[PDB]
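Let's sit down with a protein and look at its sequence and fold side by side. Go ahead whenever you are ready, and we will take it from there.
>
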Amino acid sequence: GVLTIGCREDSTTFDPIKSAQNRDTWVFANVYDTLVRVDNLGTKMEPGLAESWDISKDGLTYTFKLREAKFSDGSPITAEDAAFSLLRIRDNKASLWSDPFSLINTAKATDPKTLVVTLKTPAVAFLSQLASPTVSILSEKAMTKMGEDAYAENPVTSGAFTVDEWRKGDRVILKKNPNFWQAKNVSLDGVEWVSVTDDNTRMRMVQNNELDTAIFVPFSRVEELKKDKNVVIHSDPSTREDHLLINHEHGLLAKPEVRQALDMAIDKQSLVKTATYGQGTVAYSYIPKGSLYHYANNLQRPYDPAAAKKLLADAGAKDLKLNYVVNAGNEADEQIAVIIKDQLAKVGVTANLQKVDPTQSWQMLVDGTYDISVMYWTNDILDPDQKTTFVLGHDTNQNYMTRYKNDQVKALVAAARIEADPAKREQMYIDLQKLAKQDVNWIDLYYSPYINISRKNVSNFLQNPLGRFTLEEVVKN
């Protein structure tokens, strides 16, 4: 009656505004609910806490009509709760998501059922923006009774589940929230996210019935696990992209040329086909294929070890040594690093692999104690602004911890967001994909579907294109 999910990185918080990591957002996307949601197919917005909403001509006022719906503890979910949840993303100091939410003049609830939001400038991305798990309706009353620190360990929740117990680093145990306004549709009695950092171990736990489901199926095992009759491999359309991060404030990695040389010394074809076993598709743009404004003809630098040696030598960077942070137990990461190390040695670049606990590598990216490291990004919304801001906006996240700094790009990101001409807006994200590619913000690696595993008695274990799991629709037989 309780569904266990093997995962890799583990929960750090339950306050959406202080985490930019799927280890939290894929967990609490089922713990809270949002005003707006996205369908399973990831093609449109559908109603959530707000049963309907309307837009003024000027395009600066969003009015939301709220349905009758209660929190985890019984109290009602009012538009004053939503107003408070939006506002703290823009205003709380600890917010990792403020920059796109500074476009907000006010969030106010006239009525308990009514939420009125006034922006400084139109922004078509805003409705889409509300679907993201970061803007999850919280309880103003409970956080203003408990405090923001204590809330993030035992939250009062608006979604299908509550955090029953949380053994840090080990497993998050969720209980079905009967006060959830769609609790009648939820078969499951609880969810357990169980952190298993080694991919093989996580796969054997599923096959050995120690886990009902698992995310992040090692690519090497997809073909054999697709013929295993006791389990089901999911391959869901995604907004996922993997990239090699570059610390631009680490010496000669600051030079575009040097980054360019590394981009040219890494054979994407052979790397994607070997590390991903043909599950991957070579990435050439930071906006994932199939997502809004993706630019199919973005530059792919051909593999050219000769031109990379020359760029490096001209840049005074001939004996470039790099600290390449690797997530141990992550098969793709390990495999990619081996390939990358081998290819870089051919242009005279020494990648040293520092293998680290996968749960720990993100903090090393924030503190910048790395030269290169592989990471991934998945969209939480149906608009390009979320990733553009995190990766290129020069917000508190320092462009996915790369510390890439380009003033034209920083300006273009804000203007792309504000632009109301849909055709010109699309053109600004094409320029962003070209600019990021020219400056080598990071090295684009591959697009891949979400590949997951479930035991055959588990039904509707779908991950949606935005990374949200339909755990409300799951049936355990």
